Amino acid sequence: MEFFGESWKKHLSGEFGKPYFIKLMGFVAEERKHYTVYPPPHQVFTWTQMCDIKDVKVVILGQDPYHGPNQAHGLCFSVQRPVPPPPSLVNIYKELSTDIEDFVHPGHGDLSGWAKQGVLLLNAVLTVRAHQANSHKERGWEQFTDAVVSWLNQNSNGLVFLLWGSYAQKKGSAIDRKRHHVLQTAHPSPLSVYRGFFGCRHFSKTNELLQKSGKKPIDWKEL
């Protein structure tokens, strides 16, 4: 695999040879031949390119990538300029405006600044056919992302997992609550944000936790 961070490849390359992954790449390769597939190949693994796997401190689980032109680019809840922050991200910024005193809305929805600090913005499914949500589900990506989640679960220490919504809470249901910190709440989406996300204060909490264990906190305003 290309466009895949070396530090991550060194620990996860074992997945590339497994049958489920091999079949997966073939399905994706076949899809790209007939339709437009997001994100483009060089951005499918952006989450492995923003920081060394050893610097991962926070994990935010997402589901499917955005299926609109130039929206998805490898990180969950993130969109490239000049795409405006989607409803869910505006609510994320809203919570931050009350939870983190120095946070400022940057106007854009590009979360690369967080990924650079060790915030793994991982979607469960990494590709999607243009304008067809969930089109690439149950093709092999989930087995891969679960493999990634599992590696981090068994090999890291003191990570903070942010599980927002039903899909993420289910996928993160196996995280060791003793070895790691798991914060859960409603999905930031307008349809469920009022059920608990507003007021969850997960960003301030994440930093209090990271800092307590002697780790570098996330400067959320650094986007």
Side-chain angles (χ1 to χ4, degrees), residues 11 19-20 30 37 45 47 53 63 70 85 104 128-129 134 141 155 159-160 162 174 185-186 189 198 201 217 220:
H11 292 310
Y20 86 88
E30 248 292 302
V37 177
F45 302 110
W47 48 280
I53 192 166
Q63 196 177 329
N70 307 291
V104 183
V128 57
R129 191 185 294 186
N134 305 145
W141 281 128
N155 299 291
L159 294 185
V160 175
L162 303 188
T185 193
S189 164
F198 282 142
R201 307 209 62 192
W220 301 100

Side-chain angles (χ1 to χ4, degrees), residues 79-91:
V79 298
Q80 292 191 295
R81 254 179 172 165
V83 177
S88 288
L89 186 48
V90 301
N91 285 339

Side-chain angles (χ1 to χ4, degrees), residues 169-185:
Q169 286 178 12
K170 291 178 176 298
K171 192 181 182 64
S173 61
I175 296 152
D176 185 313
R177 268 61 169 173
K178 175 190 176 182
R179 184 173 186 169
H180 298 294
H181 302 285
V182 180
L183 298 177
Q184 304 181 288
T185 193

Side-chain angles (χ1 to χ4, degrees), residues 128-202:
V128 57
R129 191 185 294 186
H131 65 266
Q132 296 188 182
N134 305 145
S135 44
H136 288 189
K137 66 178 186 178
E138 309 177 320
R139 295 290 183 173
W141 281 128
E142 298 90 330
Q143 287 188 68
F144 178 62
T145 49
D146 284 332
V148 177
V149 173
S150 183
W151 187 87
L152 286 288
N153 186 48
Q154 304 284 310
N155 299 291
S156 300
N157 287 298
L159 294 185
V160 175
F161 287 78
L162 303 188
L163 306 182
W164 311 329
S166 170
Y167 189 99
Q169 286 178 12
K170 291 178 176 298
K171 192 181 182 64
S173 61
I175 296 152
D176 185 313
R177 268 61 169 173
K178 175 190 176 182
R179 184 173 186 169
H180 298 294
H181 302 285
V182 180
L183 298 177
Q184 304 181 288
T185 193
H187 190 282
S189 164
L191 296 183
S192 55
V193 67
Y194 283 106
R195 292 164 186 163
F197 184 82
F198 282 142
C200 71
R201 307 209 62 192
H202 279 185

